Amino acid sequence: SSSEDEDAGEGISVNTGPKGVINDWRRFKQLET
């Protein structure tokens, strides 16, 4: 009833680029030092 459970080229040797960028390199290097 209702009731239920529901309920390559590695060697580079960069030539001139370091010379070109040395200005910024030293700019950062002074503050880092």
């Binding site: 010379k19 040395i22 200005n23 030293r26 700019r27």
Partner: protein, 75 residues
């Protein structure tokens, strides 16, 4: 092009800068000239007090950075 690690000022800019520095040094002490001039009272960073009318003492006690202003102080 120069690639010099520093600042460069050339011509009218540096001339005006030098003139400004010299004029500032002059204007510091221009108020202490003549019998109607008045003294200045300088305070150090440690609280020491100096009251003076002498231009040399004022320019010696002052801490100056510009080279032309330093030239005027040494003058």
């Amino acid at each position: 092009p120069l690639s010099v690690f520093g600042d460069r000022s050339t011509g009218e800019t540096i001339r005006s800068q030098n003139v400004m520095a010299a004029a500032s040094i002059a204007n510091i002490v221009k108020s202490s000239l003549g019998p109607v001039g008045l003294d200045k009272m300088l305070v150090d960073d440690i609280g020491d007090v100096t009251i003076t009318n002498d231009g040399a003492t004022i320019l010696k006690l002052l801490e100056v950075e510009h080279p032309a202003a330093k030239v005027l102080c040494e003058l």
